[PDB]
Coordinates of C-alpha atoms (C1' of nucleotides) in Angstrom, one line a residue:
Chain U
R1 CA 26.7 -28.8 -26.8
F2 CA 28.6 -26.5 -29.2
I3 CA 27.4 -23.0 -30.1
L4 CA 29.0 -22.7 -33.5
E5 CA 28.1 -19.5 -35.4
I6 CA 27.6 -19.8 -39.2
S7 CA 27.7 -16.6 -41.1
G8 CA 27.9 -15.7 -44.8
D9 CA 26.9 -13.2 -47.5
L10 CA 24.5 -15.3 -49.5
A11 CA 22.8 -18.6 -48.8
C12 CA 20.8 -21.3 -50.7
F13 CA 19.0 -23.8 -48.4
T14 CA 17.2 -25.2 -51.5
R15 CA 13.7 -26.5 -50.5
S16 CA 12.9 -30.0 -51.5
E17 CA 9.8 -28.8 -53.3
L18 CA 11.4 -26.0 -55.3
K19 CA 14.6 -27.7 -56.6
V20 CA 14.0 -26.7 -60.2
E21 CA 13.8 -23.1 -58.9
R22 CA 16.2 -23.1 -56.0
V23 CA 14.0 -21.1 -53.6
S24 CA 16.0 -21.1 -50.4
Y25 CA 14.5 -22.2 -47.0
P26 CA 13.5 -19.5 -44.6
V27 CA 16.3 -20.4 -42.1
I28 CA 19.3 -22.7 -42.3
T29 CA 18.3 -26.3 -42.9
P30 CA 18.9 -28.6 -39.8
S31 CA 20.2 -31.1 -42.3
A32 CA 22.5 -28.4 -43.8
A33 CA 23.7 -27.6 -40.3
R34 CA 24.5 -31.2 -39.6
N35 CA 26.3 -31.4 -43.0
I36 CA 28.3 -28.3 -42.0
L37 CA 29.2 -29.9 -38.6
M38 CA 30.3 -33.0 -40.4
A39 CA 32.4 -31.1 -43.0
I40 CA 34.1 -29.4 -40.1
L41 CA 34.8 -32.8 -38.5
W42 CA 33.3 -36.3 -39.0
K43 CA 34.2 -40.0 -38.7
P44 CA 32.5 -43.3 -38.9
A45 CA 32.3 -43.1 -35.1
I46 CA 30.8 -39.6 -34.5
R47 CA 27.2 -38.9 -35.5
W48 CA 26.2 -35.3 -35.5
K49 CA 22.8 -34.1 -34.3
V50 CA 21.4 -30.6 -34.5
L51 CA 19.6 -29.4 -31.4
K52 CA 18.7 -25.7 -31.9
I53 CA 19.1 -23.0 -34.5
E54 CA 19.3 -19.4 -33.4
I55 CA 18.9 -16.8 -36.2
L56 CA 21.2 -13.8 -36.1
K57 CA 20.3 -12.0 -39.3
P58 CA 17.0 -11.0 -40.9
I59 CA 15.5 -13.1 -43.7
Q60 CA 16.4 -11.3 -47.0
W61 CA 15.3 -12.9 -50.3
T62 CA 17.5 -12.2 -53.4
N63 CA 16.5 -13.8 -56.7
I64 CA 19.5 -14.8 -58.8
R65 CA 18.4 -16.7 -61.9
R66 CA 21.4 -19.0 -62.6
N67 CA 22.0 -21.2 -65.6
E68 CA 22.4 -24.8 -64.5
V69 CA 22.8 -28.2 -66.2
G70 CA 20.0 -30.8 -66.2
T71 CA 21.8 -34.0 -67.2
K72 CA 24.1 -36.0 -65.0
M73 CA 27.5 -37.5 -65.9
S74 CA 28.2 -41.2 -66.3
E75 CA 30.4 -43.7 -68.2
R76 CA 27.9 -43.6 -71.1
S77 CA 28.1 -40.1 -72.6
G78 CA 31.7 -39.0 -72.6
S79 CA 30.7 -35.3 -72.8
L80 CA 27.8 -33.0 -71.8
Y81 CA 27.6 -30.0 -74.0
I82 CA 25.6 -27.5 -71.9
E83 CA 24.3 -25.9 -75.1
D84 CA 21.9 -28.8 -75.4
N85 CA 21.2 -29.3 -71.7
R86 CA 20.9 -25.7 -70.3
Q87 CA 18.7 -25.1 -67.3
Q88 CA 17.7 -21.6 -66.2
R89 CA 17.1 -22.6 -62.6
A90 CA 16.1 -19.7 -60.5
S91 CA 17.7 -19.2 -57.0
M92 CA 15.9 -17.1 -54.4
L93 CA 19.1 -16.7 -52.4
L94 CA 19.3 -15.5 -48.8
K95 CA 21.4 -12.3 -48.6
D96 CA 23.1 -11.5 -45.3
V97 CA 22.5 -14.5 -43.1
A98 CA 23.9 -15.6 -39.7
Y99 CA 23.0 -18.5 -37.5
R100 CA 24.6 -20.0 -34.3
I101 CA 23.7 -23.7 -34.5
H102 CA 23.6 -25.3 -31.0
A103 CA 24.3 -29.0 -31.6
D104 CA 26.1 -32.0 -30.2
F105 CA 27.0 -35.5 -31.3
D106 CA 26.7 -39.1 -30.2
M107 CA 28.2 -42.4 -31.3
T108 CA 27.5 -44.8 -34.2
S109 CA 27.4 -48.6 -34.1
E110 CA 30.8 -48.7 -36.0
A111 CA 32.6 -46.6 -33.4
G112 CA 35.7 -48.8 -33.5
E113 CA 38.3 -48.5 -30.8
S114 CA 38.7 -44.7 -30.3
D115 CA 35.1 -44.1 -29.3
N116 CA 35.9 -41.3 -26.8
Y117 CA 33.3 -38.5 -26.8
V118 CA 35.7 -36.0 -25.2
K119 CA 38.4 -36.7 -27.8
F120 CA 36.0 -35.9 -30.7
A121 CA 34.6 -32.9 -28.8
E122 CA 38.1 -31.4 -28.3
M123 CA 39.0 -32.1 -31.9
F124 CA 35.8 -30.3 -33.1
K125 CA 36.5 -27.4 -30.7
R126 CA 40.1 -27.0 -32.0
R127 CA 39.0 -27.3 -35.6
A128 CA 36.3 -24.6 -35.0
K129 CA 38.5 -22.2 -33.0
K130 CA 41.6 -22.4 -35.3
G131 CA 39.6 -22.7 -38.6
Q132 CA 40.2 -26.3 -39.6
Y133 CA 37.6 -28.3 -41.6
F134 CA 37.5 -31.4 -43.7
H135 CA 35.4 -29.5 -46.2
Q136 CA 34.3 -25.8 -46.4
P137 CA 30.8 -25.4 -44.9
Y138 CA 28.1 -24.5 -47.3
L139 CA 25.0 -22.3 -46.7
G140 CA 22.7 -24.8 -48.4
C141 CA 24.8 -24.8 -51.6
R142 CA 28.6 -25.2 -52.1
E143 CA 28.6 -22.0 -54.2
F144 CA 28.3 -20.1 -50.9
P145 CA 30.7 -20.6 -47.9
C146 CA 30.3 -20.1 -44.2
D147 CA 32.3 -17.6 -42.2
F148 CA 32.2 -20.0 -39.2
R149 CA 33.3 -18.9 -35.7
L150 CA 33.0 -21.0 -32.5
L151 CA 31.1 -19.0 -29.9
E152 CA 31.1 -19.8 -26.2
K153 CA 27.7 -18.2 -25.5
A154 CA 26.5 -15.2 -27.6
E155 CA 28.7 -12.8 -29.5
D156 CA 26.2 -11.3 -32.0
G157 CA 22.8 -9.7 -32.1
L158 CA 19.5 -11.3 -33.3
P159 CA 16.7 -9.6 -35.1
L160 CA 13.9 -12.1 -34.3
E161 CA 13.4 -11.0 -30.7
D162 CA 9.7 -11.1 -30.3
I163 CA 7.2 -13.7 -31.7
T164 CA 7.8 -13.9 -35.4
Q165 CA 6.5 -16.0 -38.3
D166 CA 6.3 -19.8 -38.3
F167 CA 7.9 -21.5 -41.4
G168 CA 5.9 -24.7 -41.2
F169 CA 7.3 -28.2 -42.0
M170 CA 11.0 -27.9 -43.0
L171 CA 13.3 -30.7 -44.0
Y172 CA 14.8 -31.9 -40.7
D173 CA 17.2 -34.6 -41.7
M174 CA 16.8 -37.4 -44.3
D175 CA 16.6 -40.9 -42.9
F176 CA 19.7 -42.9 -43.8
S177 CA 19.3 -45.8 -41.4
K178 CA 18.1 -48.0 -44.2
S179 CA 21.1 -47.1 -46.3
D180 CA 24.2 -49.2 -46.7
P181 CA 27.7 -47.7 -46.3
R182 CA 27.8 -44.8 -48.7
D183 CA 24.1 -43.8 -48.8
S184 CA 21.9 -44.5 -51.8
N185 CA 18.2 -45.2 -50.7
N186 CA 16.8 -42.9 -48.1
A187 CA 13.6 -41.2 -46.8
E188 CA 12.6 -37.7 -45.8
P189 CA 11.4 -37.2 -42.2
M190 CA 10.5 -33.6 -41.5
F191 CA 9.4 -31.5 -38.5
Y192 CA 7.6 -28.3 -37.5
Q193 CA 9.3 -25.0 -36.6
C194 CA 7.0 -24.8 -33.5
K195 CA 7.5 -21.0 -33.2
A196 CA 10.5 -18.8 -34.2
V197 CA 10.6 -16.9 -30.9
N198 CA 14.3 -16.3 -30.9
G199 CA 16.1 -19.6 -31.4
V200 CA 14.1 -22.5 -33.0
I201 CA 14.9 -26.0 -31.6
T202 CA 14.9 -29.3 -33.5
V203 CA 13.1 -32.5 -32.5
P204 CA 15.7 -35.4 -32.4
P205 CA 14.5 -38.8 -33.9
Chain O
rG1 C1' 35.4 -39.7 -44.4
rU2 C1' 29.1 -42.5 -45.8
rU3 C1' 25.3 -37.3 -46.4
rG4 C1' 24.1 -31.6 -52.6
rA5 C1' 27.4 -32.8 -55.3
rA6 C1' 28.2 -30.4 -61.4
rA7 C1' 26.1 -25.6 -62.9
rC8 C1' 27.4 -19.3 -68.9
rA9 C1' 24.6 -15.0 -69.6
rG10 C1' 25.3 -16.6 -73.6
rG11 C1' 27.8 -17.3 -78.7
rG12 C1' 26.7 -11.0 -80.7
rU13 C1' 23.9 -6.5 -83.0
rC14 C1' 27.0 1.1 -86.0
rA15 C1' 20.8 3.8 -83.4
rG16 C1' 20.5 5.8 -86.9
rC17 C1' 20.4 6.8 -91.9
rU18 C1' 19.7 13.9 -91.3
rU19 C1' 17.5 18.3 -90.5
rG20 C1' 19.2 26.6 -92.4
rC21 C1' 18.0 29.3 -85.8
rC22 C1' 16.0 31.5 -88.2
rG23 C1' 13.3 34.7 -91.4
rU24 C1' 14.7 40.7 -88.8
rA25 C1' 14.2 44.9 -86.3
rG26 C1' 16.6 53.3 -85.3
rG27 C1' 19.0 53.7 -78.1
rU28 C1' 15.8 56.4 -78.9
rG29 C1' 12.7 62.3 -78.2
rG30 C1' 17.4 65.9 -76.5
rC31 C1' 19.8 68.2 -72.6
rA32 C1' 23.9 75.9 -71.9
rU33 C1' 29.4 73.5 -67.4
rC34 C1' 27.1 76.8 -66.0
rG35 C1' 25.4 81.2 -63.6
rC36 C1' 31.6 84.2 -61.1
rC37 C1' 36.1 85.6 -59.3
rC38 C1' 41.4 92.5 -58.5
rU39 C1' 46.9 88.8 -58.6
rC40 C1' 47.1 90.7 -55.4
rG41 C1' 48.0 94.1 -50.8
rU42 C1' 53.8 96.3 -52.1
rC43 C1' 59.1 96.6 -51.1

RNA sequence: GUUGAAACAGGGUCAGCUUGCCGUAGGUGGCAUCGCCCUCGUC
């Protein structure tokens, strides 16, 4: 297990229901935490899996109505012109957030030759301690980074000490087992928060 | 290296065109520097 602390100023764990108005999730998405761990280090052999999220900063909603685009790019239209495809997508961002995601990893079917668990574990530990990453972690959206810092146990205070509020079904991690190399078609299996006592745990598939 | 990616607050708008702080009004009634004092004792 790795107790990697994710911290940042603003966040945007955009809910699947409110994508037109990017209302952020109450806490960090387990799928977002797995994506962060993969952007720090990943390979066609290592399969990241989130185990437990421990909140370290109170939930603070901040509405930032951003102006987005609503039409994708392709080989057809050589240009976009946002003056004809403007989208005033709201974004209830999460100001001042901090989470120490306890998570580990397994092995995929295409592990290859170098399928050593200890090798990938040490590589992830070095990348988290020195500050190396394949891609900058994002707090639900790439417009917000993550001041990550690998913790050995606990090096920060948490506000949710007693029994708090349950956030219901949140997006655990989309099912990409039915997807070919480079995902395309997927599903959406979700899970309950159980109870945000101090550090909510995830239910592995 | 197969897992949210792309995202405008805008192009831009004289806060004025203006309006007498005045019309206007006694520091006044009026009150003794006084009631008083050897330039001396005198060489």
